[PDB]
Design an enzyme around this catalytic site. Structure first.
Site, PDB file in Angstrom:
ATOM      1  CG  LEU A 257      -1.700   1.649  -4.510  1.00 10.80           C
ATOM      2  CD1 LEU A 257      -1.589   1.358  -5.981  1.00 10.80           C
ATOM      3  CD2 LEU A 257      -2.784   0.804  -3.891  1.00 10.80           C
ATOM      4  CG  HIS A 258       0.898   7.148  -0.436  1.00  6.19           C
ATOM      5  ND1 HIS A 258      -0.261   7.886  -0.366  1.00  6.19           N
ATOM      6  CD2 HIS A 258       1.895   7.978  -0.053  1.00  6.19           C
ATOM      7  CE1 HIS A 258       0.022   9.111   0.042  1.00  6.19           C
ATOM      8  NE2 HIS A 258       1.324   9.192   0.239  1.00  6.19           N
ATOM      9  CD  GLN A 259       6.430   7.150  -1.989  1.00  5.15           C
ATOM     10  OE1 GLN A 259       6.976   7.896  -2.802  1.00  5.15           O
ATOM     11  NE2 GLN A 259       6.267   7.477  -0.715  1.00  5.15           N
TER      12      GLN A 259
ATOM     13  CG  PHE B  77      -1.861   1.210   1.230  1.00  8.48           C
ATOM     14  CD1 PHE B  77      -2.950   1.293   0.384  1.00  8.48           C
ATOM     15  CD2 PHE B  77      -1.602   2.274   2.082  1.00  8.48           C
ATOM     16  CE1 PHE B  77      -3.770   2.403   0.394  1.00  8.48           C
ATOM     17  CE2 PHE B  77      -2.425   3.384   2.094  1.00  8.48           C
ATOM     18  CZ  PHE B  77      -3.506   3.447   1.248  1.00  8.48           C
TER      19      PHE B  77
END
Lengths: 189, 293
Positions: free
Chosen positions: A30-32, A27
């Protein structure tokens, strides 16, 4: 018709399996990925893989239509792993109706922060900062756990995700995503 | 006729404690004065080892000796069992030498699996292996650790050269000592994961480090011949091949694929399949252990 693409990822087994930390790195990457892409047009869900409502699934499904999907974290736009997943490829969705919702929540289990905010907010005294209204009597809590160390300038969070009303009731065309990294009305299986 | 009451196999592929030190990417060449990361404490209270804020790259370094003569036990109780074990490992290497096991050890040194938790969030890892002949570099490698997979074993010229060098060291034809130094791009001020002691992280001299047995456990994950469903991948070669963090035990002794039943069939009554379980039992005695009555 809501967001008609899905990736039935399956985290393989591995003799290092901290699930909080595997989903943490996933996650976080994914945020990056999506802050590098940029846009409040994406979906994330977690299908019925939580057997009890304590654990969280060993799977995932991202819901972006065509372009955000193909450009964001996928076969292009490196994950940096490509070995611990060996995942597949998306396609069009079927027609279910479980009312399509997921949610983020956070609670209070450390009244030191609240008492310190009182001391800072209008210069509260120690006795009232000790008994004005802390929650020392009881420590709130939440079950589904993921770690998600700070994106930057911080330390180990402990994030909590509650699947919303997944009732077979109706469906609606709402916004794309709330929070930052988490779709709104998302198709569920 | 029987197994000895005491049987002791000494360790091959002898590692060291992987000393860790921070640094910057594209400075891996002159990476000798790099400052070692230390363990700090914070708020009951725990320990944490980060990088300095002007360093985006971790570098671990450890020296790996390989010994050779892995089928020779260091302790027995009867000469006949040692002669039969030496005959079985000798006909193993006379049927096929250390060509699959050395290739998988060169794989586990190629992809930085000795980076246990630091590998899984790394942007780019490069492993440098220097074969120290007398006190200098004889042959140097430069492996892309992320391009070489964790569950698939590729074919390459340099990796097969490293496999041949580890094979020559494992057969006994040469002394092999390798300085293995891994540069992992993790990020500015990110957290490293050294081995935790009996939360207190392990250190030697004001320097956070990984244990020697954790590095020896990581380059030993080569076991792919076991009755699991396809999707687990390689596990480490323990007898009664266990994952105690997962609470499961593959090759449990009710199935006849553990180390002890395959050993007492492959030695005492000459029974094992062609390639797979022979490689498993030979890698398990490469690891070493305590066996007997």
């Amino acid at each position: 018709f809501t967001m008609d693409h899905y990736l039935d990822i399956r985290l393989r087994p591995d003799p290092e399996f901290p699930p909080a930390q595997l989903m943490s790195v996933l996650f976080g990457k994914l945020h990056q990925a999506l802050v590098a892409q940029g846009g409040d047009r994406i979906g994330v869900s977690f299908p019925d893989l939580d057997e009890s409502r304590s654990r969280l699934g060993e799977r995932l499904r991202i819901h972006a239509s065509a372009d955000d999907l193909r450009a964001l974290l996928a076969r292009p736009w490196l994950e940096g792993l490509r070995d611990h997943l060996q995942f597949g490829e998306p396609a069009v969705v079927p027609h279910p109706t479980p009312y399509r919702q997921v949610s983020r929540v956070q609670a209070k289990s450390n009244p030191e922060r609240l008492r310190r905010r009182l001391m800072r907010r209008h210069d509260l005294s120690e006795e009232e900062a000790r008994k004005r209204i802390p929650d020392t009597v009881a420590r709130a809590l939440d079950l589904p756990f993921v770690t998600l160390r700070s994106q930057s300038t911080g330390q180990h969070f402990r994030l909590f995700i509650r699947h919303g009303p997944l009732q077979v009731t109706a469906e609606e065309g709402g916004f794309t995503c709330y929070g930052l990294s988490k779709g709104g009305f998302v198709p569920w299986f | 006729l029987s197994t000895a009451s005491v049987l002791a196999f000494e360790r091959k592929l002898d590692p060291s404690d992987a000393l860790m030190s921070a640094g910057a990417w594209a400075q891996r060449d002159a990476s000798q004065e790099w400052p070692a990361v230390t363990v700090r404490e914070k708020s009951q209270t725990v320990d944490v080892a980060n990088l300095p804020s002007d360093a985006d790259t971790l570098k671990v370094r450890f020296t790996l000796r390989v010994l050779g003569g892995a089928g020779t036990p260091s302790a027995c109780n009867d000469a006949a069992y040692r002669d039969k074990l030496l005959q079985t490992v000798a006909t193993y290497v006379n049927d096929q030498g250390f060509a699959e096991l050395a290739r998988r050890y060169a794989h586990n040194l190629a992809n930085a699996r000795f980076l246990w938790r630091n590998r899984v969030g790394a942007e780019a890892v490069e492993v440098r292996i220097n074969h120290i002949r007398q006190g200098e570099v004889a042959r140097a490698w430069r492996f892309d650790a992320l391009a070489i997979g964790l569950r698939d074993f590729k074919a390459d010229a340099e990796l097969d050269a490293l496999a041949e060098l580890i094979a020559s060291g494992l057969s006994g034809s040469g002394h092999v000592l390798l300085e293995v130094v891994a540069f992992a791009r993790i990020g500015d001020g990110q957290e490293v994961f050294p081995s935790q002691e009996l939360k207190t992280l392990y250190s030697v001299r004001d320097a956070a480090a990984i244990h020697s047995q954790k590095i020896g456990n990581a380059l030993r994950t080569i076991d792919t011949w076991y009755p699991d469903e396809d999707g687990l991948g390689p596990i480490a070669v323990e007898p009664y091949g266990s994952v105690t963090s997962q609470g499961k035990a593959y090759r449990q002794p009710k199935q006849k694929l553990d180390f002890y039943t395959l050993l007492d069939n492959w030695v005492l009554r000459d029974e094992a399949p062609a390639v797979e379980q022979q490689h498993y039992v030979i890698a398990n005695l490469i690891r070493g252990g305590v066996f007997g009555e």
